Amino acid sequence: FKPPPRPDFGTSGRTIKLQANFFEMDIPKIDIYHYELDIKPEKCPRRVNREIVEHMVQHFKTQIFGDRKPVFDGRKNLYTAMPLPIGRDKVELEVTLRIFKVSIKWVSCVSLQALHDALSGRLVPETIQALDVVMRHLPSMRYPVGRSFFTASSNPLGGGREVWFGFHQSVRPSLWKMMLNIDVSATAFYKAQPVIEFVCEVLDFKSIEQKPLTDSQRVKFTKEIKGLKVEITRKYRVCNVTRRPASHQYPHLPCLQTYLPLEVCNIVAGQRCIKKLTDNQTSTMIRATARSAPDRQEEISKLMRSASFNTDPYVREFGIMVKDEMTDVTGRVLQPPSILYGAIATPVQGVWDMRNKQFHTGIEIKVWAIACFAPQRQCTEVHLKSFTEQLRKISRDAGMPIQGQPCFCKYAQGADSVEPMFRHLKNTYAGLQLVVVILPGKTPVYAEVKRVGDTVLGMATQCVQMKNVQRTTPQTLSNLCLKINVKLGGVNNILLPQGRPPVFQQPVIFLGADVTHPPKPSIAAVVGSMDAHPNRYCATVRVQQHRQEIIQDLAAMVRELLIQFYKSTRFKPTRIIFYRAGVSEGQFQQVLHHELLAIREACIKLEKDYQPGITFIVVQHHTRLFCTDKNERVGKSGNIPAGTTVDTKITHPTEFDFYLCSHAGIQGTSRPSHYHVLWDDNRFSSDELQILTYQLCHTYVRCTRSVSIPAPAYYAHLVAFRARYHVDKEHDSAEGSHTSGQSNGRDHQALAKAVQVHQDTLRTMYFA
RNA sequence: UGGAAGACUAGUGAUUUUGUU
RNA sequence: CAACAAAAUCACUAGUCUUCCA
Ligand SMILES: [Mg+2]
């Protein structure tokens, strides 16, 4: 039903001063008059319409507009701080800049007093849209493309191109009052200048002084220059650039198309590079624009102050004022869970290592095989011997002792060759635990391998690149053994028992789920814990409707996971925690209605009188956050430290939600995960639930580092990814076609039974 | 397919306005 | 008050490039 109110703002963790790129407000309570306008010819651009409106205000200033500074959305909506005399008869005018006709009609008055009332009641709308239209009308003229301010910055990229900068804007509500926000997002420009400069810089001869050019020198300038307007050093447009020079079509060089020389013509300035560029030009701007988090905060702080909207009367007509400094917040660092190995590790900065640490319950690998598909000359038997030696060494060091040589090794080619050999393997060796596979590149047979590995034969198929075999390193094989161990039913590590909050002091199951869509089936996966720590997650998966977000068959999946938990522990979980990734903000009211009830239904199916406490959470932008203290800047990227939580001055004013930056920022500016708590029967405090959501980011087995979202969610994502790798035989066959519309039901049932993982594989974390 | 993460291109959904019902 | 089409914003999802990790 209704999502719960915020129980409290929390107290646990460190204290850090933090800065969000939002901006404070003044928001006067005046009523802005809003009118509707019709402009002919309607096909003209919005910027041309705004220019026509300005020209009409200037031309008809005597009796119609006066000194007013109206703001126009571009097509229909116009706004003013004072009423116009046009109310409410037919008003039409003409403008000549190239001749246009316009009309004006008054609409209504958007009251900011209603905005103030909604800010402290009526739990807020025409008001926000009108404010968004008003707040960036004039600056958008400085950008026709875009609706944001620009700076007239110079920086030659290549082939006659340059870079000019500008930042995009937004306005969102928050506690007390609204908040404007700015984020730097720039573009690129094709250079405009005299054609002599094009011959010098772009053609790049020995000097200005040449001849009918070859392909490369021509394409350096002739191909790039197409698309720009030109004038006399007479407005014209470039429609073609000919390989044949002006003499055959400095006329002896390649010319532009009517034709123009290269000595008395200047390209028109102010034209942004509209066209999408070649692959080589994608990194030409990153050569001079690769920047980190401080090189976004500093740039925003410089440019917003350089704009200085408060100083100009032309935007102070409405009286709206925005503070220069960006928003200040207080953040808290959640403590990390100590990870216990069969050795206690602290996830320091969201990273820990397997140095002198072994798995909690290792698996003794006795009978194991290798199925190589790389070329024999490129991957010889000595390479396989070296890979075997390093794999055995790393597995021995990790508490998963691989014993002796592999019992089987054969070279093979073709995708269909995996199925017989593996069958023969399980026919010729009993107790075959591990089945290593070697594949070069993105070959399709990998999918076939997993289609033999998990679905039908039930063997722990592990795959590795040819380059990794040729270039084995300790880290690669360590991370590979980390998933080989859980593929064989082992347990890598467990959360420390005493370091967990009271939610863990009773039997509890931590469900998680995710859904992935095609680039036909939409795969929804649900994972559930199987022990009290937990580390071992059983997985269920269902193909469902195209692009559907709702997990249609969640009740049966939760029933299966609860049955497995009861059989594994002979106890019923008194609490249920259900994470849910992949949900859009517009669907929460539906999701909270549906999936929660289904979970309850599963409990009703497990036992008549069974009633645990369910917690329903959803995990998810432009809401960048940066440090304020110089000492708190971490690493090369300078991102906020891992585990920081923010739940004040930028989040929802009433509902329970919080931003959490669980993962460390390798590059750029990290996007914190926004956890919106949609339901809480257990009535967790902010501290306990935030600590739980942060600690479940460290039960992830595929690597020893903190992940962005909790392990129950990304495990469902991995299960869906593996199920995608698991049966579309229309593409596999030479041809595929049938009566679509009903036969896709047959394909759906086929996918359902194909993704039904084998029993030997069902009881272990194959999805690693 | 050793693992994690942030820049561009494209699909689904929620909302304000406009046109139709 | 709801659906379809257009503009804008927002959130997810997918692809192409790109950075780091013993
Ligand atoms: Mg996902």
Give the integer Cα–Cα distance in Å for A553 and A119: 40
Sorted by where each begins, the domain ranges of chain A are 27-135, 193-268, 344-492, 504-759
User: Kind of pairing, strands A537-544 and A625-627?
Assistant: unpaired
Q: How far is it, in rounded angstroms, from Cα A37 to Cα A304? A: 31
Burial class (CB in 10 A: 0-12, 13-18, 19+), A275: exposed
Phi first, then psi, for residue A491 (nearest 5°) are -120, 125
The span from the CA of A163 to the CA of A153, in Å, is 9
Q: Which fold has domain A344-492?
A: Rossmann fold (3.40.50)
The secondary element (H helix, E strand) that includes residue A304 is helix A294-307
Burial A623-644 (b: 16+ CB within 10 A, else e): bbbbbeeeebbbeebbbbbbbb
Please identify which residue in the block is written with the tokens 């404007």: A180
Closest CA to A41 of A33, A52, A32: A52
Least Cα distance to A85 among A55, A105, A56 occurs for A105
Q: CA A307, C1' C6: Å apart?
A: 33
Residues 136-175 of A with CB under 7 A from strand C: 147, 170
Is A343 near strand C, with its CB below 7 A from some atom of it?
no
- The answer to whether A197 and A265 have CB atoms below 8 angstroms apart is no
Burial call A376-385: b when 16+ CB within 10 Å, e when fewer = eeebeeebbe
Q: Is A319 helix (H, G, I), strand (E, B) or coil?
A: coil
| Neighbour tally for A420: CB within 10 Å | 12
**A724 CB neighbours strand C below 7 A:** no
Measured CA to CA, the distance from residue A76 to residue A37 in angstroms comes to: 5
Burial class (CB in 10 A: 0-12, 13-18, 19+), A442: exposed
Method used for this model? cryo-EM
The answer to whether the CB of A18 falls within 8 A of the CB of A329 is yes
Give domain A504-759's CATH number out of 3.30.2350.10, 3.90.1150.10, 3.40.50.300, 3.30.420.10. 3.30.420.10
User: What is the distance between the alpha carbons of residues A658 and A9, in angstroms, rounded to a whole number?
Assistant: 9
What's the CA–C1' distance between A128 and B16, in Å? 8
Nearest to A455 by CA among A754, A61, A760: A754
Q: A317: CA distance to ligand 1 center in Å?
A: 46
Contact A627, A640 (CB under 8 A): yes
Distance, CA of A223 to CA of A226 (rounded, Å):
6
Cα A581–Cα A744–Cα A457 angle in degrees, nearest 5: 75
Report how far residue A79's alpha carbon sits from residue A142's, in angstroms, rounded to the nearest whole number.
20
Q: Which nucleotide is nearest to A484 if distance is taken from CA to C1'?
A: B2
- A193-268 — its CATH code? 2.170.260.10
